Write a structure and sequence with these properties.
Subunit structure (chain F): Component of the 40S small ribosomal subunit.
Strand order of the largest sheet of chain G: 3-2-1-4-5
Helix content of chain D: under 10%
Subcellular location (chain F): Cytoplasm, Cytosol; Cytoplasm; Rough endoplasmic reticulum
Radius of gyration of chain G: 17 Å
Oligomer: part of a larger assembly
Strand content of chain G: 15-25%
Bound molecules: magnesium ion, zinc ion
CATH topology of chain G: Nucleotidyltransferase, domain 5
Family (chain F): Belongs to the eukaryotic ribosomal protein eS26 family.
Number of helices of chain D: 1
Helix content of chain G: 10-25%
GO cellular component, one term (chain F): cytoplasmic side of rough endoplasmic reticulum membrane
Number of strands of chain G: 5
CATH architecture of chain G: 2-Layer Sandwich
Strand content of chain D: 15-25%
CATH superfamily of chain G: Ribosomal protein S11/S14
Chains: A mainly alpha (25), B alpha+beta (103), C mainly beta (52), D mainly beta (80), E alpha+beta (91), F alpha+beta (97), G alpha/beta (136), H alpha+beta (212)
Order of helices and strands of chain D: HEEEE
Structural class of chain D: mainly beta
Biased composition (Basic and acidic residues) (chain F): 86-96
Chain lengths: 25, 103, 52, 80, 91, 97, 136, 212
RNA sequence: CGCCGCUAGAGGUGAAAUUCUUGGACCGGCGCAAGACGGACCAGAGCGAAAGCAUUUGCCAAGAAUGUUUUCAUUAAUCAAGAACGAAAGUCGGAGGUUCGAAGACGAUCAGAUACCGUCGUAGUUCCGACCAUAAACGAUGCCGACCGGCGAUGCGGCGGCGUUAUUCCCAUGACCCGCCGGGCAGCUUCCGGGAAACCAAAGUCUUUGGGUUCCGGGGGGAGUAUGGUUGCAAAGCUGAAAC
């Protein structure tokens, strides 16, 4: 796996976890 | 063109500190009726009535006419005083050569 | 419009000659004049919609 | 090994304005015998302004980047 | 002091009407309430009247201008194009 | 490591050069990095010159040439048999005869 | 018909537009102006199969049939304009042009001068391939 | 039906001064009802290079002709345009020269206004080692003024017969090559293209004046 | 798109098919409209602090180098905080929309393709306004300064050379040729010296280690993740750890 798509998957996971935090502030 | 305007600004810088001049329409009318004024400078955006009248007094009294191509704010920049001005009168050019450049 | 060259940007014109202004009158608009015919005096214009 | 104490004058003419030891410049003063009246006018070599002789009102030097070119048939000399 | 950090002139509305709407109303309310420098008298006393009308306190010279600013950039483009097609070969 | 001192292309002073498309696979390549050639061709087959030389109307004074700036990228030019590889001291070479 | 002029030694000229592509080949015979198409035969008209319509055998049969019809309508000589798809595509002509010049000059059809009017653009509106373009 | 049994044959007469005036022959349909025969003749053009018109000038420098009208089975044409062939134009572009362009709109004496172009190149002077030979670009801005200036006097006060007679030996090119010498040694000067944008009037009287 | 002629195919591929086609496609001929783009000339050439910049023309200010017996007389270098620019993509308004084309649609290839191939086509690609401040933003080489081999070039100034050549007829700048000076982009060679080597006139002048100065790294993973603060409309950026 490229470092490119590794950063992309960690970035998408970060956006999912940010939505979870904003869903329960 | 650009050398002409740079000549105008530099010679106005010299007249600013060396020569003697009056400002304002009402005060320049005294100098043009007394003939003490040699050369009048009118801003671009002065009203056409006042421009025609000053040019008519100059063509009566044998006096050099110049149209400063520029707004009356930067005519005040040219004369080096913070307020705006529409009419310069070089009644005594001390060191300059503004009158000995064009007429 | 017969005097002006093509590319002239006008407003407040007449459809038929002599009805004192119909086309392109609203705020901030313009018609554009193109393609004169010398004989049979007609002229194309672009309206503010896109109608030629 | 190279004698930097006493270099060759062929080298000293070829080298730059300030690379050499005494660092004298390359310019000179030239005396122009005017074609018009008679007057000898002292003028600099790499002059930057136009040079008007005060009598004849003829342009002596067109100033140019580098050294100025003259008008027409005006000798000069080297003096120090 | 500096009493607001972001809203500027739009603070008179308050917490309602929406963020992007206040953001886009800011940049043209400043334009329609700003004093402009008159090109005729040279003073800075232009003020907007009813929409399209601009007025200067000195010399009472009333100029038809833009709806929110003093000149539309499109209108300046049209004036430059009109003077160009004017002196283009004299019609 | 550096395989080449010039990094393949010839950009040294510049910061950015225009890209130009390749002919085969249509990839944009900076125009010094690309493999550049220039085909000067007789527009006829050189064997088929003589057939037109038989039935030509004029006295064989018309001789048309076709000139094409031909423009390859390296990823397909090597497959298309132009820029064949060399050795360590053979990369220091210039123009082929 | 009788067609043009008699008094042999004089030639009647026509312009032949040859359009050589990498997946088709056109031969086209027109008058000196360009409106009046005299005879028009492609490669796929002469060859049944789909992949052979850029092969040089197709240009020979198209050339033989057009050289037949031009002799039928009584025009002797041909100036030859040659071209390919030149907008963004391959500026070089296809393989069919080498065949079509030979198989026009072989059977009658005397040839004047030949030009290569391939439409070369000034500055290349975007290419069909993409960034990295064709892969395999 | 076989419509080439129907199509009619005209001959194409060239305008004056080339050397000979037989271009070739064309073919339309037939004047039938609404379709008059002279309609497409008014629209057709002709692309023909020299050595058959001007009798052994240069082989390149094509000419474009617009067929004015027809006159007793003879269709006559007026001048339309002048172009160069693709092989000659794509030749003489060498890697280490400096190609110089020029273009100008210009009106003739009569109602014709026409646009014409210009191409120029540098030249390796003899006894030269520096293989580049570029120009300092200020001579290029000088020479674009020069090549725009001279074309205005060969076209602006002249009419069409005289400007075509100037285009026969390229007297414009030989004049620019002569006047160019003090600025730079240019080489292979041509006008490369001239094309019309507006024709004044049909003028069959001017057509007969073109003849004699 | 408008007409004009001809005529059954035209695209498109590893091979075909989706698609357009007697309601006349593709093809030729003329003309019009729209938007994007400036090939060939274009190079180990220039300029810009970089990101970048290629049709002509004018206007507007700006800058390097060179020449200088010009002026000022230490005003200098590097810089935490702070600040201006900063490609592509992305976001928000307004205008239009040629080509290309994420997404999406099909047709084929394959065991499967949602992938490469082909046909259509969305946002974007364009311009004008604002934001985001990231890249293999690469010479993977901080900045200033000095010293240490040569050689032929090339670009820009400056200088020297009854060599040649174009004007009209001196005269100058024009165009080559010869050579020198300044600094710029570079290259060949070498046992200058270095380094782990590839290689480098700097990556040298280092165990004989010290010219000035900013930013930085301390086995790999966890990880530029969590968690706080801060910027951003959002995408996210900046700062940034531990358990194991
Ligand atoms: Mg490797
Ligand atoms: Mg880069
Ligand atoms: Mg495969
Ligand atoms: Mg067509
Ligand atoms: Mg951008
Ligand atoms: Mg989005
Ligand atoms: Mg919105
Ligand atoms: Mg909206
Ligand atoms: Mg598409
Ligand atoms: Mg970074
Ligand atoms: Mg640094
Ligand atoms: Mg850095
Ligand atoms: Mg030089
Ligand atoms: Mg000069
Ligand atoms: Zn006022
Ligand atoms: Zn390719």
């Amino acid at each position: 796996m490229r470092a490119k798509w590794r950063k992309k998957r960690m970035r998408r996971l970060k956006r999912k976890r940010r939505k979870m935090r904003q869903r329960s502030k | 063109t650009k050398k002409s305007l740079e000549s105008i600004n530099s010679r106005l810088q010299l007249v600013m500190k060396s020569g003697k001049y009056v400002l304002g329409y009402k005060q320049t009318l005294k100098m043009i009726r007394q003939g003490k004024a040699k050369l009048v400078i009118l801003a671009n955006n002065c009203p056409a009535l006042r421009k025609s009248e000053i040019e008519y007094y100059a063509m009566l009294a044998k006096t050099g006419v110049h149209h400063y191509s520029g707004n009356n704010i930067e005519l005040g920049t040219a004369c080096g005083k913070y307020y705006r001005v529409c009419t310069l009168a070089i009644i005594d050019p001390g060191d300059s050569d503004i009158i000995r450049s064009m007429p | 419009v017969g005097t002006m060259p093509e590319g002239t940007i006008v407003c407040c014109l007449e459809e038929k000659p002599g009805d004192r202004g119909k086309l392109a009158r609203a705020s901030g608009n313009y018609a554009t004049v193109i393609s004169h015919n010398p004989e049979t005096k007609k002229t194309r214009v672009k309206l503010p919609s896109g109608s030629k | 090994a190279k004698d930097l104490l006493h270099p060759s004058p062929e080298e000293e003419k070829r080298k730059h304005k300030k690379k050499r030891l005494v660092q004298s410049p390359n310019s000179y003063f030239m005396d122009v015998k005017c074609p018009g009246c008679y007057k000898i006018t002292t003028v600099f070599s790499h002059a930057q302004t136009v040079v008007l002789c005060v009598g004849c009102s003829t342009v002596l030097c067109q100033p140019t980047g580098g050294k100025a070119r003259l008008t027409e048939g005006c000798s000069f000399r080297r003096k120090q | 002091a500096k009493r607001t950090k972001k809203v500027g002139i739009v603070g008179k509305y308050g917490t309602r009407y929406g963020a992007s709407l206040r953001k886009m109303v800011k940049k043209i309310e400043i334009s329609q309430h700003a004093k402009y420098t008159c090109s005729f008298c040279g003073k800075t006393k232009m003020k907007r009247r009813a929409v399209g009308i601009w007025h200067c306190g000195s010399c009472m010279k009333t100029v038809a201008g833009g709806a929110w600013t003093y000149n539309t950039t499109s209108a300046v483009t049209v004036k430059s194009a009109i003077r160009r097609l004017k002196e283009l070969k004299d019609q | 490591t550096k395989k080449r001192r010039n990094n393949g292309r010839a950009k040294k002073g510049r910061g950015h050069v225009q890209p130009i498309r390749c002919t085969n696979c249509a990839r944009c390549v900076p125009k010094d990095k690309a493999i550049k050639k220039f085909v000067i061709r007789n527009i006829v087959e050189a064997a088929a010159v003589r057939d037109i030389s038989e039935a030509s109307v004029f006295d064989a004074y018309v001789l048309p040439k076709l000139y094409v700036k031909l423009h390859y990228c390296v990823s397909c030019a090597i497959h298309s048999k132009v820029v064949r590889n060399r050795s360590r001291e053979a990369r220091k070479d210039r123009t082929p005869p | 018909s009788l067609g043009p002029q008699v008094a042999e030694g004089e030639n009647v000229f026509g312009v032949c537009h040859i359009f050589a592509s990498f997946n088709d080949t056109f031969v086209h015979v027109t008058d000196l102006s360009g409106k009046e198409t005299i005879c028009r035969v492609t490669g796929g008209m002469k060859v049944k199969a789909d992949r052979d319509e850029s092969s040089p055998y197709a240009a020979m049969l198209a050339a033989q049939d057009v050289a037949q019809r031009c002799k039928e309508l009584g025009i002797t000589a041909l100036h030859i304009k040659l071209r390919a798809t030149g907008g963004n595509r391959t500026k070089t002509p296809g393989p069919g042009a080498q065949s079509a010049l030979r198989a026009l000059a072989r059977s009658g059809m005397k040839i004047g001068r030949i030009e290569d009017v391939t439409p070369i653009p000034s500055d290349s509106t975007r290419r069909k391939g993409g960034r990295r373009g064709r892969r395999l | 039906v076989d419509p080439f049994s129907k199509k009619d044959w005209y001959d194409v007469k060239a305008p004056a001064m080339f050397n000979i005036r037989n271009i070739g022959k064309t073919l339309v349909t037939r004047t039938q009802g609404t379709k008059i025969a002279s309609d497409g003749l008014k629209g057709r053009v002709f692309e023909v290079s020299l050595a058959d018109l001007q009798n052994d000038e240069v082989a390149f420098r094509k000419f474009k002709l617009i067929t004015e009208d027809v006159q007793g089975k003879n269709c006559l044409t007026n001048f339309h345009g002048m172009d160069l062939t693709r092989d000659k134009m794509c030749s003489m572009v060498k890697k280490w020269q400096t190609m110089i362009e020029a273009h100008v709109d210009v009106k003739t004496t009569d109602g014709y206004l026409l646009r014409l172009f210009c191409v120029g190149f540098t030249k390796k002077r003899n006894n030269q080692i520096r293989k580049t030979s570029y120009a300092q670009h200020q001579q290029v801005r000088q020479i674009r003024k020069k090549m725009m200036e001279i074309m205005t006097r060969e076209v602006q006060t002249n009419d069409l017969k005289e400007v075509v007679n100037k285009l026969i030996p390229d007297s414009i090119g030989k004049d620019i090559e002569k006047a160019c010498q003090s600025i730079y040694p240019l080489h292979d000067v041509f006008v490369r293209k001239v094309k019309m944008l507006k024709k004044p009037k049909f003028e069959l009287g001017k057509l007969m004046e073109l003849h004699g």
